[PDB]
Amino acid sequence: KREHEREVIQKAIEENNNFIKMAKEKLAQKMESNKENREAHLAAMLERLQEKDKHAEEVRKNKELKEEA
Amino acid sequence: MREIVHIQAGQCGNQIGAKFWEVISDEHGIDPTGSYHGDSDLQLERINVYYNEATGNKYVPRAILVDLEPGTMDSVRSGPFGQIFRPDNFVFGQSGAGNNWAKGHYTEGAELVDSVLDVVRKESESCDCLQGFQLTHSLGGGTGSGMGTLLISKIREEYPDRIMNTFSVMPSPKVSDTVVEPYNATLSVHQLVENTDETYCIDNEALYDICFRTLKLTTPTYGDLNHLVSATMSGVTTCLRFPGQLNADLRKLAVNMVPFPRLHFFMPGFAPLTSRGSQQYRALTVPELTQQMFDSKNMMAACDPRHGRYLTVAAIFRGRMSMKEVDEQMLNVQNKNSSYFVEWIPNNVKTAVCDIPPRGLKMSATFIGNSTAIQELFKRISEQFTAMFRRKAFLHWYTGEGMDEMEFTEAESNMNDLVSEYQQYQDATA
Ligand SMILES: CC[C@H](C)[C@@H]([C@@H](CC(=O)N1CCC[C@H]1[C@H](OC)[C@@H](C)C(=O)N[C@H](C)[C@@H](O)c1ccccc1)OC)N(C)C(=O)[C@@H](NC(=O)[C@@H](NC)C(C)C)C(C)C
Ligand SMILES: Nc1nc2c(ncn2[C@@H]2O[C@H](COP(=O)(O)OP(=O)(O)O)[C@@H](O)[C@H]2O)c(=O)[nH]1
Ligand SMILES: [Mg+2]
Numbered sequence: 001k002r003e004h005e006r007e008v009i010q011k012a013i014e015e016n017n018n019f020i021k022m023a024k025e026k027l028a029q030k031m032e033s034n035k036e037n038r039e040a041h042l043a044a045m046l047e048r049l050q051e052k053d054k055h056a057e058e059v060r061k062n063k064e065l066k067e068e069a
Numbered sequence: 070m071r072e073i074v075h076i077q078a079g080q081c082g083n084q085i086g087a088k089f090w091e092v093i094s095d096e097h098g099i100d101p102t103g104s105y106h107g108d109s110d111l112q113l114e115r116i117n118v119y120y121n122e123a124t125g126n127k128y129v130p131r132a133i134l135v136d137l138e139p140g141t142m143d144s145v146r147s148g149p150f151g152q153i154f155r156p157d158n159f160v161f162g163q164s165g166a167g168n169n170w171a172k173g174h175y176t177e178g179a180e181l182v183d184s185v186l187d188v189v190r191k192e193s194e195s196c197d198c199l200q201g202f203q204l205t206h207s208l209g210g211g212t213g214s215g216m217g218t219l220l221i222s223k224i225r226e227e228y229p230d231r232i233m234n235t236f237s238v239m240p241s242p243k244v245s246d247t248v249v250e251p252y253n254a255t256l257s258v259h260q261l262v263e264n265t266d267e268t269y270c271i272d273n274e275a276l277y278d279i280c281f282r283t284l285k286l287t288t289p290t291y292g293d294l295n296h297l298v299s300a301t302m303s304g305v306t307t308c309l310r311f312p313g314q315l316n317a318d319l320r321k322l323a324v325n326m327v328p329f330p331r332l333h334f335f336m337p338g339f340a341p342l343t344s345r346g347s348q349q350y351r352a353l354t355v356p357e358l359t360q361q362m363f364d365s366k367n368m369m370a371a372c373d374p375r376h377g378r379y380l381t382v383a384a385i386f387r388g389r390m391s392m393k394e395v396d397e398q399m400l401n402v403q404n405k406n407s408s409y410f411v412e413w414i415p416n417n418v419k420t421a422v423c424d425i426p427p428r429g430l431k432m433s434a435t436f437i438g439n440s441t442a443i444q445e446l447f448k449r450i451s452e453q454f455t456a457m458f459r460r461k462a463f464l465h466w467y468t469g470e471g472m473d474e475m476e477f478t479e480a481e482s483n484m485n486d487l488v489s490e491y492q493q494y495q496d497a498t499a
Contacts, residue, residue: 001222008175012471 070117071318072196073309074189075203076220078135079166079173079213081238082206084291085271087145088299089205090130093119093310094150095428096303101150103127111425114312121155121195133158133188135220137177137212138165158192160185166211170253171470173215182219189224200319201232201266205302208257209240209250209273218260225264232319234267236302239446241274241371242453244294249463251453252477258447259480261334262487266323268334269305269437271298272446274371283366284344296345300427301337301369304435307385308421315421316383325419326381326439331487332494334443336370338362338436343429352431355390359398362434370446377442378495379410382418385435388426395422413499441495444488451484 077086094100097116098107105113105128120128132154136142139161145151146159162181166172193199202224206213221233237257240250261268276297280289308316316322327333340361341353353361361367362384365374386395399420403410410417427433457463458477468474 002226005175005179005219008171008471009179010471012176012469015469015471 070197071200072131072198073118073200073203073319074192074196075119075130075132075205076135076185076189076217077132077205078217078220079206079210080136080141081210082204082213082217083134083136083141083145085236085238085295085298085302086132086134086205087148087150088295089302090132090153091150092299092303092428093306094130094153096425097128097310099128099153101153103129103153109425111311115310117197118200118309129153129155131192133160133185133192135160135181135185135212135216137162137173137181137216139163158188160188166215167466168209168247168249168253169211169466169470170215170256171467171472173211173213173217174219174256175215175472176470178212178216178219182216182223185220186223186227190227193228199228199231201234202228203234203236205236207238207240208254209238209245209247210253213238214253214257218257218264221260221264232267232323233265234269234319235261235265236269236271236298237261238298239270239272239274239370239450241272241277243277244273248457249466251450251457252463252467254450255454255484256477256480258450258487259483262331262483266333267319267326269301269337270334270370270443270446271301271337272370272372274449275369278371279342279366279369280344283342284347286344293344297339297342297369300343300433301339301435303427304339304385304387304433305337305437307387307423307435308383311423311425313421313423315419322383326383326437328380328414328439329490329494331490332380332439334439336368336372336374336436336438336440336443338364338367338369338438340364340367340434340436341430341432342367348429352388353433355386355394355398355432358386358432358434359395359402362436363402367436368438370443371449372440372442372445374438374440374442375409376445377409377440377491379417380414380439380441380494382410382439383437384418384420385437386420386422386432387424387434388430388432389424390422390432392422395420411494411497411499413497441491444491444495447484447488447491451481451488454481 077083098105098112134142142161164177206217208214240254276294280286280293340358
């Protein structure tokens with residue numbers, strides 16, 4: 001009976017600890033995934049804007065090429 | 070000098086425990102300060118059964134007060150008889166047990182139980198010749214039920230050859246709306262079947278119904294309920310406390326009352342039934358005492374004794390009366406209703422008479438029955454248990470404390486086995 005009593009309270013501790021552990025890990029996973037997704041969305045936006053800048057350089061390059069002819 | 074050590078646990082346990090000490094202190098002529106002021110030598114002759122002697126000829130209850138929250142014990146320490154208790158014998162926590170057997174038995178109670186056992190040990194060591202223990206508690210809450218049965222098991226381990234006696238208050242939906250009480254009670258009965266020698270089944274269902282039906286109290290209080298309990302506890306301990314022939318110690322009582330070790334759950338009864346301050350002016354006659362003490366309406370367990378058979382009976386008469394008339398009337402009950410007494414235990418009804426009446430009465434009588442009808446009580450608890458357990462309802466409160474469902478299944482099976490064993494001897498012929 002005493003061994004059983006010890007087992008019950010260690011079980012209660014273990015399940016509480018495991019709850020905390022899994023909550024902790026779920027949250028770290030979610031936060032890392034969110035961080036990476038948001039950063040990727042910004043990176044893509046900037047990438048498109050930078051392609052506009054390049055395009056604009058070509059337009060002016062094109063105008064300069066046309067000009068002397 | 071055969072000492073009994075008294076333990077009271079949880080709210081109910083301490084409430085009825087404190088009332089027990091008020092009632093028997095007055096009977097023994099001990100005042101709230103522990104000073105004796107009585108007029109009869111009969112009062113002191115076996116005073117050492119329940120009291121230690123101090124210097125100044127102070128008498129101190131051999132009582133240990135236990136709870137997982139301070140409220141009720143603060144109440145007691147501020148009550149009338151608060152000072153009478155040994156201050157170091159107050160053992161309490163702060164967390165409470167939240168009406169949860171698992172908290173009392175496995176988690177919260179486990180943190181406190183060694184402290185209690187330390188006090189128990191100090192009291193036992195002081196004993197010339199310890200008889201055993203008596204515990205007051207309810208089965209429906211968390212501390213008295215869970216920690217109370219934890220204590221019973223630990224005390225049995227340290228004192229395996231001593232008698233363990235309990236006054237156990239059974240829950241009823243007539244008195245409590247807490248949904249988990251049938252769980253707490255079933256888990257506790259499982260413990261009691263294995264580890265006590267004698268258990269007085271004090272049923273809140275019966276207590277409430279006596280107050281409402283018989284005493285005509287439209288709004289019964291715990292005070293009213295406990296008035297019945299303390300009258301009963303006084304009556305059933307009379308043979309332990311005063312000079313006498315029959316059932317004069319815990320072991321002799323058990324040998325007279327318990328023919329099979331698991332069947333040690335007693336139905337108490339009392340007459341006359343009174344409310345607090347009813348203060349009645351006519352004494353009952355011996356025939357009246359005898360008729361009423363055996364009546365269903367006077368039982369403290371809500372079981373119809375006519376639905377079962379008596380294995381054994383103890384009857385205690387108190388007051389100045391004709392012992393001849395007592396004998397005649399007791400014989401009349403048995404000879405008039407002989408079919409309700411098992412025929413394979415000859416002469417199974419024993420009678421004691423004590424000259425000192427309880428306070429406020431000239432005449433009273435107390436009944437202790439080992440009846441197979443007590444199965445009705447366990448059946449009632451079992452039905453309430455199964456209604457929830459079949460859907461595993463409210464179990465998360467228990468599994469959160471580390472318990473497994475298997476433990477519930479085992480407790481239920483053991484109580485249903487107990488029920489079946491009563492039925493077996495009910496139907497048994499010589
Ligand atoms: C039938 C169930 C108990 C018995 C009563 C009783 C509780 C009581 O006695 N309580 C609540 C602690 C205070 C105590 C009494 O005040 C009312 C004091 C005077 C007392 O009796 N005090 C005694 C002397 C004291 O030793 C003591 C004992 C136990 C606990 C605390 C204090 O109050 C009527 N209750 C809950 C009720 O009647 C409640 N009704 C119900 O619960 C109903 N269901 C909604 C049914 C079960 C009756 C109403 C209050 C809503
Ligand atoms: N007869 C009686 N029953 C009580 C008293 N106090 C609580 N109860 C009952 O005891 C059960 C609740 O247990 P309680 O002792 O309050 O919980 P604990 O403090 O955890 O042991 C319920 O069935 C209540 O109706 C009391 O003073 N007298
Ligand atoms: Mg309570």
